[PDB]
Design a protein around this ligand. Structure first.
Ligand SMILES: *[C@@H]1O[C@H](CO)[C@@H](O[C@@H]2O[C@H](CO)[C@@H](O[C@@H]3O[C@H](CO)[C@@H](O[C@@H]4O[C@H](CO)[C@@H](O)[C@H](O)[C@@H]4O)[C@H](O)[C@@H]3O)[C@H](O)[C@H]2NC(C)=O)[C@H](O)[C@H]1NC(C)=O
Ligand SMILES: *[C@@H]1O[C@H](CO)[C@@H](O[C@H]2O[C@H](CO)[C@@H](O[C@@H]3O[C@H](CO)[C@@H](O)[C@H](O)[C@@H]3O)[C@H](O)[C@H]2NC(C)=O)[C@H](O)[C@H]1NC(C)=O
Ligand SMILES: *[C@@H]1O[C@H](CO)[C@@H](O[C@@H]2O[C@H](CO)[C@@H](O)[C@H](O)[C@H]2NC(C)=O)[C@H](O)[C@H]1NC(C)=O
Ligand SMILES: O[C@@H]1[C@H](O)[C@H](O)CO[C@H]1O
Ligand SMILES: O[C@@H]1[C@H](O)[C@H](O)CO[C@H]1O
Ligand SMILES: [Fe+3]
Ligand SMILES: [Zn+2]
Ligand SMILES: [Zn+2]
Length: 341
């Protein structure tokens, strides 16, 4: 069984994946697609074995029968004696960030503002905030809530893509992959940091990893945590140090999914690959680091300490949790059960 074919979303993840391939002795090989959904399709077809996914894509993947294999585990202090690989996942905090200088902007004053989403169908950048909004406004017209937005994956012509910038040559505007300047956690935050949008829907970690010198990237260099605030659901504004108490929801960690019949082997190969390229990987610093990508979260989030065993051999609905799964169906009622491909 020993060859695992990873699916890369976009050319940058492709470049990284090939490096990982070369270094793995072709134990890991690559397949590329322009979107996560397409990568879900190559795995369904058996042309790729796996990829790591945000919760919202796990939902889509799971309805098609794909199963969670290993979950991303970030740097947590609590539960410190257990190996990261066997450490329960704690989840991440989906937050709404704004510029402090943008005084008076609260959760209750978001209507008609400019927003930045990681990508349509993602947990923190879309399902959480939009499900909240739809719920709160009683309307399915979330395409009309923000005056303008950058929501990779939405219709390029629509105002949900208006603030997206595309790539270096302005091409691929709004594609849900790293080619789009404002794609993902980093891109949605850069979208806010450059005042292209008024609010960014990312996770707690995003704000920290890109402020106070934590990045070096041109646009982030000069960012200071105090210039940002989190919008709490109670209409309040708190510093980005108050995430445990000012968030939209806690999200299930991004996780690797593969076809049910390939899971066991994808799991085995993966644990052996992070032992080599993970946070303490034998060859990480020197040769290759699976969880680093110049701050671009390619294939995995950069703050991933390791990929952990799941426990309860959970279904995708159990891994996402009932609370989260209800939100996504209730939100998708605006677009009853079956694989979207
Ligand atoms: C948007 O608005 C909709 C409509 O209100 C939201 O949908 C509702 O979401 C909640 C999910 O938290 C859900 O309530 C649960 O109902 C379950 C049973 O019907 C309860 O299950 C029990 O939980 C116990 C432990 O907590 C456990 O002991 C027991 O075995 C069982 O698991 C559960 O506790 C909650 O009460 C509503 O059912 C759901 N409404 C429906 C059916 O549409 C949606 O989440 C809202 N928000 C977002 C973010 O989009
Ligand atoms: C919001 O996201 C932040 C980035 O992921 C994260 O920030 C920091 O918090 C954790 C601890 O809570 C630190 O983790 C480690 O803790 C050890 C043991 O005490 C420290 O010695 C060490 O510094 C280590 O990093 C992170 O360092 C730190 N992140 C950075 C780079 O600033 C928050 O935990 C997170 N959660 C919130 C605030 O809700
Ligand atoms: C690719 O996978 C192969 C097969 O799993 C690896 O080779 C094994 O490495 C183990 C040590 O963990 C040795 O006992 C043997 O040499 C191999 N057989 C086993 C037990 O699988 C190898 O580590 C990987 N190659 C590269 C370049 O990473
Ligand atoms: O099921 C769990 C819970 O939903 C938690 O909030 C995060 O991680 C998921 O795997
Ligand atoms: O890509 C599609 C669309 O975004 C849809 O709205 C939900 O199912 C996904 O697979
Ligand atoms: Fe996510
Ligand atoms: Zn909470
Ligand atoms: Zn179960």
């Amino acid at each position: 069984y020993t060859r695992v074919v990873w699916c890369a979303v976009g050319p940058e993840e492709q470049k990284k994946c090939q490096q990982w391939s070369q270094q793995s002795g072709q134990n890991v090989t690559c397949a590329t697609a322009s979107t996560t959904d397409d990568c879900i399709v190559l795995v369904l077809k058996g042309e790729a074995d796996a990829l790591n996914l945000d919760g919202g894509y796990i939902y889509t993947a799971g309805k098609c029968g794909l199963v969670p294999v290993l979950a991303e585990n970030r740097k947590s202090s609590k539960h410190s004696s257990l190996d990261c690989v066997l450490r329960p996942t704690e989840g991440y905090l989906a937050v709404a960030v704004v510029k402090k200088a943008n005084e008076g902007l609260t959760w209750n004053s978001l209507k008609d503002k400019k927003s930045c989403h990681t990508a349509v169908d993602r947990t923190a950048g879309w399902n959480i905030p939009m499900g909240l909004i739809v719920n709160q406004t009683g309307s399915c017209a979330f395409d009309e809530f923000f005056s303008q937005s950058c929501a990779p994956g939405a219709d390029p012509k629509s105002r949900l893509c208006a603030l997206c910038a595309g790539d270096d040559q302005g091409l691929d505007k709004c594609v849900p992959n790293s080619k789009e300047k404002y794609y993902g956690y980093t891109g949605a935050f850069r979208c806010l940091a450059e005042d292209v949008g008024d609010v960014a829907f990312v996770k707690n970690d995003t704000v920290w990893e890109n402020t106070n010198g934590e990045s070096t990237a041109d646009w982030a260099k000069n960012l200071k945590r105090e210039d940002f605030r989190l919008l709490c659901l109670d209409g309040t504004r708190k510093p980005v140090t108050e995430a445990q108490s000012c968030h939209l929801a806690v999200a299930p960690n991004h996780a690797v999914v593969s076809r049910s019949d390939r899971a066991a082997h994808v799991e085995q190969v993966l644990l052996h690959q992070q032992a080599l390229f993970g946070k303490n990987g034998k060859n990480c610093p020197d040769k290759f680091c699976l969880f680093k990508s110049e701050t671009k979260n390619l294939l995995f989030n950069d703050n991933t300490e390791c990929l952990a065993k799941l426990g309860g051999r959970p279904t995708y609905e159990e891994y996402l949790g009932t609370e989260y799964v209800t939100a996504i169906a209730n939100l998708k009622k605006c677009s009853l059960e079956a694989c979207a491909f």
